[PDB]
Every structure is written in C-alpha cells, then in structure tokens.
A paper describes a structure:
EF-Tu brings aminoacylated transfer RNAs (aa-tRNAs) to the ribosome. The N-terminal domain (G domain) is a guanosine triphosphatase (GTPase) that is followed by two β-barrel domains, important for aa-tRNA binding. G-domain proteins generally function as molecular switches by alternating between inactive GDP-bound and active GTP-bound states. We provide structural and biophysical evidence that phosphorylation of EF-Tu at T382 acts as an efficient switch that turns off protein synthesis by decoupling nucleotide binding from the EF-Tu conformational cycle.
The structure of pEF-TuT382 suggests that the introduction of a negative charge in the loop containing T382 might prevent the compact state of EF-Tu associated with binding to GTP, thus trapping the protein in an open conformation. To challenge this hypothesis, we introduced the T382E mutation, a potential mimic of a phosphorylated Thr residue, and used spFRET to monitor the EF-TuT382E nucleotide-dependent conformational cycle. Thus, the presence of a negative charge in this position is sufficient to mimic the effects of phosphorylation in EF-Tu. E382 that replaces the pT382 is involved in electrostatic interactions with the switch I region via R59, as seen in the case of pEF-TuT382. All these results strongly suggest that EF-TuT382E is a bona fide structural and functional mimic of pEF-TuT382.
Author numbering: 9 to 394
Write the structure that this text describes.
Amino acid sequence: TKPHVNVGTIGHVDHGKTTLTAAITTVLAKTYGGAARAFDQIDNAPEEKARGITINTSHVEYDTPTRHYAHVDCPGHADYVKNMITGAAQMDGAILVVAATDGPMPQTREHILLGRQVGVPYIIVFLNKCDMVDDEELLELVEMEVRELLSQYDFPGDDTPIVRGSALKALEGDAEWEAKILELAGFLDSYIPEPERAIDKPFLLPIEDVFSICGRGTVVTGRVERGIIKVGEEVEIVGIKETQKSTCTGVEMFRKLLDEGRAGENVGVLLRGIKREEIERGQVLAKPGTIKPHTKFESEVYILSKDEGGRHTPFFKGYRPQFYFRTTDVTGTIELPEGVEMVMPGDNIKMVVTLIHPIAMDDGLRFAIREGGREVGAGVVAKVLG
Ligand SMILES: Nc1nc2c(ncn2[C@@H]2O[C@H](COP(=O)(O)OP(=O)(O)O)[C@@H](O)[C@H]2O)c(=O)[nH]1
Ligand SMILES: [Mg+2]
Ligand SMILES: [Mg+2]
C-alpha cells in the first residue's frame, strides 16, 4: 500500500532531536491524524538488541498523507554510531537537527561523516531553537556553516532543504512555529524519494548452496536479494575466484519450473555451462557488469564491548578476524588509522580491510566481524578500493 520510509533525527546532544521527534508526531497528529507522542515517551528510549549489540533507541511511527515513516531518535552519540553501523533499518533519509544558538558542533560533523560513510543518501536540516535567536544574520551564518559542512562530506549543501523553526514552541502549540514542522514533513515527502524497490535493482543472488540435477546441470540455490533472473539471461558468478560467465538454463521453486526468479524468492537457478566444483562459498549470481569482486575496502566498524558478548581485551595491527558478508566468513587483514595501535571493545573505528578472497561488494554492504564463530563486531563497506 502506502510507501514505508526509514528516517531519524541526527545531530549534537541537546540540539532538540527528541523535542523535534515529539513535535513531528504531535503536529502531524493534530493536522491529518495519527497518534501524538509526548517528549517523555521518546526521551527515555528503551534498550534495543541487534544480535548482542545494545542500542538505546526510540522507534516512533508517523504518517504524512502519502507516506508512512518509521523514525529513529537515540539519546546519545554512541547509540547513533551503533545504529548507523548495525541498526535494524538503514535510513532512507535523516533529519539533521542543529541548534541556532550553538551552530554545528563536534557530533554534527560526526553524524554527517557517519551518514556519508554508511550510505545515508539524503539529509534534511531542521534549524532548531530559533525562538531564542533575535539576530537574523546569526541564523544565516549558522545556515551557511551547515551547508558548507554538508558539502565538505559530499552532501548537496547548496540544495539541502533547511527549515528554520522551534521544536519546543511547536510542541507547546504556537501555530506560527507549528507551521514549520509541517514544512519539515513536506520536505521528508518531496526531497527523500521513495527508496528503490529490490525488484528494480540489478539481479543479485547470494549462493547458499549448489546441487546438480542429473541431465539438467548445476543448480545454484539462494534467496534472490535483488532484481529478476529470467530463463535464457546471461549471468556472472562473482566471488572467490576469477569471475565466470554463464546462462540461466532454468529457475526452479520446489520442483516448479518458473520462467523467472524475483527478489525475495527462494529459488534454484540452473546453469548449464558450469560444474559444482567451480562454485565456492561467498560467491554470488549477478547481472553481468553490475557488481565487482573486491579484496580491499574501507569500512566503518563497531566492536562489541564485553557486556555485549564480545572481547574483553583490545586488538592490535595484526588482528585477522573473519568478515561475514552474506553467506560465509572470509579472513581479512586490518589497517588501522595512522596513529592507532589498538582498538578497545565498545569502540568504533575506520578500518581498511584486505580479504584473503575477493567478494562481490558495493558501498553500503553490511558485514559481521567474527573471531571463531563468535561475533566481535559489525561494519559497513564505506569505499571499495579494489
Ligand atoms: N528554546 C528552545 N529550547 C528547546 C527547543 N527544542 C528543544 N529545547 C530544549 O533543549 C533541551 C534539549 O533538547 P532535546 O530534544 O531533549 O535534545 P536532544 O539531546 O538533541 O534530543 C531541552 O531542555 C529542551 O526543552 C527549541 O526549539 N527552543
Ligand atoms: Mg534526545
Ligand atoms: Mg570506549
């Protein structure tokens, strides 16, 4: 039915993210229905669990006339880091809250940086606490500083919608300020496009298993991650070895012969021109020339604290864990930032990883870091280096 969009409020502590989340729910409920949430209900965020990682996050839901929004708001900076790296849902857009009285602060920069790294594709700005600013030149200055900051991190700062408002005075009922929250919800709808459907994206099937129908050839099984594979279409086996080229001779779903396989479907893809022995764990089926195998990438990673079931001790330069991309662990070597000798449990770092085998990889791809079979961290491919 109506499109689902994943959003959230980012920005420095005390800039008014929680008050804004409340003001969004309240004003949108007061004008065209829904349930209004109080400041207190969003402020004391419950503890959420993402495979051992503990994150304090408030999940609020609100509707505009044409869209349904699942909104994330976190109490502290640490939760934002965790949520952007390992959180339940990847943001389709973010609302960056900047207090006009402070202007951009260290966490403002950090969240913009993380958002770029993690692939948050759109940012809208709410210039908060305007009820406290009497100097228009001060507002223009803050607004210019924010546009420059966004542009520095490859966001289109010159084209970014910036709403001047007051989350407090709007929760309070002041209609002149409540107009600006509707202006903000308007930009959520107009500026964040509906996220691309999995079925529309180029074909990708992570290979979960391989069998060989007698007389029909090699069957590669898995859940179609994206797009459609039609019988007769050319495919590439991208992964652990030199990329191979084949043709889909059939698609099967529990003995049912299909003409195609679509995203979200569990299917058997038949490849007449390949043998089982040529199929390796970590490999992927994909639309030729849509995904490249890489060994080297830049990632933003979060290391679990001992409390979260992770390490108790730090790791160093020679750390060689397993990187679980989609179906298998691949060992990698790590390059830490210049000046960094160790990484503590509970920390986030920018890591340059070199895998021992190439993996079909695109920016934004999430992985798990495992030592043995135990999860020690989670990460996101920020940049593919080769
Ligand atoms: N003057 C003013 N105070 C505000 C506004 N929005 C929030 N506040 C206050 O700023 C403080 C921090 O806001 P809050 O939403 O809890 O910040 P957060 O840490 O970013 O979530 C609280 O004392 C709020 O009452 C606003 O627009 N104007
Ligand atoms: Mg808050
Ligand atoms: Mg720490």
